[PDB]
Amino acid sequence: MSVEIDWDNIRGDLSVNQGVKDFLNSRLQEFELPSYVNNLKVTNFDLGTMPPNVILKQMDDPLDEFYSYNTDVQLLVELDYKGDMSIELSADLVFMILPVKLRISDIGMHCLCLLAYLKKQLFISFLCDVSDPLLENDKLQVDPSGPNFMGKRALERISLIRNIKIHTEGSVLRSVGKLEEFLVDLFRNLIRKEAAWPSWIDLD
């Protein structure tokens, strides 16, 4: 039950390159950065050059909740991604301020995820890692149609990031290390908190 996907085409569209840039920045500055850091901005999002492996599992009408203050459809997919996608950030370190440049890359997800096209727009909400225990047990309902869909227990989900690589470009190293550490932890949270159902990325 596979979904081929025109990555050539997709990796090209800027409406999408942007707007995930924007998604990130918006949610980023919603956090509290520590004192060694400033003007932390995603400068450049870049997809793989390889797509993910996409297995359709259910179609539905988008949940009510996507409807908010047909011709619409909502794919429950398995995403598997061990590809070459990279985020390019930029911050100021802290007598003086040193501008730094980072890359996040080597992002690994193997994931259940809702994809919902409606009224011109696309919503991407991750649900959980396939190897999440909560699946093995009938202890977390991932049928979005669907009583008690992601009821309690939802908060016990395992990280959706399976792995991730952040590299940057005196004893300021104490800070560029552990800067690198902060970002990971942040970025993980940014996904857990703002990209995983009940939350989602929004685009068009």
d(CA 109, CA 83): 10
d(CA 113, CA 101): 31
d(CA 45, CA 194): 17
Q: Which residues pair with 141 in a beta bridge?
A: 149
d(CA 82, CA 20): 19
d(CA 112, CA 130): 6
d(CA 109, CA 157): 14
Q: What does the block give as tokens for 16?
A: 């999408």
Q: Are the C-beta atoms of residues 165 and 117 closer than 8 Å to each other? A: no
Residue 44 identity (one-letter amino acid): N
Q: Are the C-beta atoms of residues 145 and 74 closer than 8 Å to each other? A: no
Closest CA to 144 of 191, 110, 190, 112: 112
Q: Are the C-beta atoms of residues 83 and 52 closer than 8 Å to each other? A: yes
On the CB side of 49, CA atoms within 13 Å amount to 0
Structure determined by: X-ray
d(CA 29, CA 45): 17
Closest CA to 2 of 104, 79, 97: 79
Q: Which residues pair with 123 in a beta bridge?
A: 116, 202
In this structure, the dihedral spanned by the alpha carbons of residues 76, 82, 85 and 87, taken in order and rounded to 10 degrees, is 90
Task: Tokens 């359709």: give the residue.
Answer: 56
d(CA 41, CA 33): 12
3-state SS record for the chain: CECCCCHHHHHHCHHHHHHHHHHHHHHHCCCCCCCCEEEEEEEEEECCCCCCEEEEEECCCCCHHHCCCCCCEEEEEEEEECCCCEEEEEEEECCCCEEEEEEEEEEEEEEEEEEEEECCEEEEEEEEECCCHHHHCCCCECCCCCCCECCCCHHHCCCCCCEEEEEECCCCHHHHHHHHHHHHHHHHHHHHHHCECCCCEECC
Q: What does the block give as tokens for 146?
A: 């669907």
List the Cα angle 139/143/149 in 5-degree steps: 65
Q: Which residues pair with 42 in a beta bridge?
A: 89
Domain boundaries, the chain: 1-204
d(CA 201, CA 23): 7
Omega into 198 within 30° of 0, i.e. cis?
yes
Inter-helix orientation angle 173-194/14-28, to 10°:
110
d(CA 162, CA 79): 12
d(CA 203, CA 126): 15
**Specified resolution (Å):** 3.1
